[PDB]
């Protein structure tokens, strides 16, 4: 399968996870990475993180020393490609040609229509311009609306909130982080953050804005300096999809990264996967899914006897106060509790089960205990109930012991 | 893409369509079709239809005279295939070696959890078999359940009502036909079944049976001869996910036909598709996809040239009186209705738009217009709304005009 040489499009945390584990896993032939920001690769978690206090995109570029003889074409946009003659088309004029193309391109912000010829300034927060242009504005005792109780929009209402902007977010669900979060951790986090000054809205939408007014779907207004839009991602899948590809808001791969086209693979934000717990395909938008799959991808390209992508989702989202970890699924049929669930010094792990079996946990402020958890889920474990809920246990100890 | 020999797994609609499409479009080489149904190759409409009356299977059978030098491996199961090795292991011992492999495996019944130790008859209806062991048991004044308000069900309901049966029905949803019906249809249908004595009953699951009674979760009971469960299907998708293949309640495909594996191709019930009028991913049910994507994917492996599959979907479903034609989506912003809605002598046409355009109809006992509006619909025709409402106004000149 492994065909030279070796094209990638997209230059985010999932190409360069694989190809750095192309070149340490062996493959010596040409690799040629295609990055449409004029940047040095860099990490997005620190965005809406540290990066909004220090503004110092040096501390958050990505190592790509583990990725030796790689040239990396940034500034550049892939075009097109025709999976056919093996070449893809670049937006400077020139041509590269393929043995392997792998499609990298991962996700962008969902727009907001009802806010599309707004007078206002609007943003996005994906990239470091984004996250440029939005730090410039948060001037102390400036208004900030967020739009989505997505993790990003949380981690910027307490990053603003540490500024000293007045933080206001409009949530069309009736809880935070919908997507993929416990009800018990949802309304934690809401609670945390109104404490924190945040005005959060739930069950209302935008419906449009005038003159520095946003106004919402119950007839009301929300002034604001600024309004960053968070309502979720849509793949970067049009070039898969031009080219024939099977795509539906993401580049659909099996455990291997294959895509429908012969000698195309794809990985990261931009394809819809498998969920080994589910059972279903998802597009998985998260850190550690790009760098875990892209080297799977990679792993398995350069030896077919390595095992397919095989890694079972998680998260983290650090939001002021609250360092949260949360993997695999966000329910059951039985939730435990570990700790008591308060504002005082947060501190607690949830552990969901499905007829006796670990399919989730969380951990908040809570590293120690998370390591373990994830062990538990990966092998399915089945542990005592009444030991999981117990103070006394060291869960280390049991991910160990199985 | 078109390596000799050609391997087929499944031997419904989409297998025999697809063989003869590729012997028509010139392929000389190799072709065998492993189907696991000891059965002379047959189609399934008429089962829920004529089939009830009288019979004879031999009314039934496919034709597979545009399939010459075709070797039908009736009664086997293909067990695995090794898309390393390029074979597939069979049920009776054998190996089949291929260049190119066809997925067209279809979809089974899905079956009630609750019926599960049933102690009374509990039948599907999707093989000859079935349908032999269901009209078998349609003696005049014995009493049926059917569980599920699908097309089939609906079908099998005015079957057994013309032989006799009393007919009660149930129903999780508030409405008939929920998968791919405009509301205004369904609720017809519903006072038509109700018109000819079928005991209808909505948003009612079955919570279990003891002795000949069937069990709901309102807390009420429903006696009855046979059960005959129509609650969906599910893909038979089993190979393709022990292959590696990527899958989720069906193999994803895409205009060509490919799955994630090189060499490896699906059509007809078991893949999931996508829909271009809604530009999302589903599992398409139908005769006419069976057909219609099994041609196009052999047209495309003997001529690359070729367009891949672009025909929008589209069924019928023959309920007594009720000749019933419905395509594309179920539902736009506008529904504009021609003739009366009217249980005397039923006949009428729906036309579904979206911002003026086309996107779906329906007509019942009014065939002459429904290939008009299917040729409306495939170039997103935007007629005059007040010429489609106006009972002057001829279809077909209106098709030909455009
Ligand atoms: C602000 C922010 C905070 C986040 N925080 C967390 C967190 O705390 N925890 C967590 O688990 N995840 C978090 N994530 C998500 C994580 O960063 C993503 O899952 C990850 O970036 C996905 O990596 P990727 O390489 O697949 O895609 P991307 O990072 O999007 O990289 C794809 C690259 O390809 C480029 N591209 C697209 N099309 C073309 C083309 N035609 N030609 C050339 N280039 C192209 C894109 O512009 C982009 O530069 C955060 C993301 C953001 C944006
Ligand atoms: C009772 C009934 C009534 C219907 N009525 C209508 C209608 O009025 N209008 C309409 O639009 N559609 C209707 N349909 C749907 C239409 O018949 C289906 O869409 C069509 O049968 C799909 O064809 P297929 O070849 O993809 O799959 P199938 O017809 O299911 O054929 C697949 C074959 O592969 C076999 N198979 C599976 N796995 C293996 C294996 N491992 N090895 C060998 N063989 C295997 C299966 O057993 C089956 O024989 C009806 C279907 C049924 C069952």
Redesign the pocket.
């Known amino acids: 399968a492994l065909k030279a040489p070796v094209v990638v499009?997209?230059?985010?945390?999932?190409?360069?996870?694989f190809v750095a584990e192309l070149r340490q896993a062996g493959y010596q032939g040409l690799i040629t990475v295609?990055?449409?920001?004029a940047?040095r690769?860099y990490?997005?978690?620190?965005?809406?993180?540290d990066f909004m206090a220090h503004g110092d995109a040096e501390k958050i570029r990505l190592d790509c020393k583990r990725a030796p003889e790689v040239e990396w074409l940034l500034g550049?946009?892939?075009?097109s490609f025709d999976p056919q003659a093996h070449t893809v088309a670049?937006?400077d004029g020139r041509t590269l040609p393929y043995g392997t193309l792998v499609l990298?391109?991962?996700?962008?912000?969902r727009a907001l229509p009802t806010l599309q010829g707004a007078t206002m300034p609007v943003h996005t927060?994906?990239?470091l311009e984004?996250?440029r242009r939005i730090q410039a504005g948060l001037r102390p005792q400036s208004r900030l609306l967020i739009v989505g109780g997505g993790?990003?929009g949380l981690?910027?209402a307490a990053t603003a909130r540490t500024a000293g902007v007045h933080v206001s977010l409009v949530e069309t669900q009736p809880r935070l982080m919908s997507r993929a979060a416990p009800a018990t951790l949802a309304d934690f986090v809401a609670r945390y953050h109104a404490a924190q000054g945040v005005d959060l809205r739930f069950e209302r939408s935008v419906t449009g804005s005038v003159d520095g007014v946003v106004l919402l779907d119950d007839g009301t207004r929300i002034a604001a300096d600024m309004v960053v839009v968070g309502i979720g991602?849509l793949a970067?899948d049009?070039?898969a999809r031009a080219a024939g590809l099977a795509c539906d808001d993401g580049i659909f791969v099996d455990a291997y990264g294959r895509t429908t086209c012969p000698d195309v693979y794809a990985?990261?934000?931009?394809?819809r996967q498998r969920n080994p717990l589910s059972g279903r395909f998802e597009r998985?938008?998260?850190?550690?899914?790009?760098?875990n799959?892209?080297i799977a991808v990679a792993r398995h390209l350069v030896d077919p006897t390595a095992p397919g992508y095989a890694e079972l989702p998680?998260?983290?989202?650090?939001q002021g106060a609250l360092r949260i970890q949360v993997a695999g699924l966000a329910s059951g049929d039985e939730e435990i509790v570990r700790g008591e669930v308060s504002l005082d010094a947060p501190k607690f792990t949830l552990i969901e089960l499905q007829k006796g079996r670990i399919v989730g946990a969380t951990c908040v402020n809570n590293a120690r205990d998370f390591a373990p958890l994830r062990r538990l889920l990966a092998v399915g474990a089945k542990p005592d109930r009444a030991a999981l809920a117990d103070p006394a246990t060291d869960l280390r100890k049991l991910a160990a012991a199985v």
Chains 1, 2 share one sequence.
Request: proline share 6%; glycine share 8%; aromatic share 6%.
């Open positions: 499009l997209g230059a985010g945390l999932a190409s360069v996870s295609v990055g449409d920001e940047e690769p990490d997005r978690p620190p965005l809406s993180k550049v946009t892939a075009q670049l937006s990298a391109t991962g996700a962008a912000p927060l994906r990239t984004d996250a993790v990003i981690e910027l991602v970067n049009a070039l990985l990261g934000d931009v394809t998985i938008e998260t850190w550690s899914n790009a760098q799959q892209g998680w998260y983290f989202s650090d």
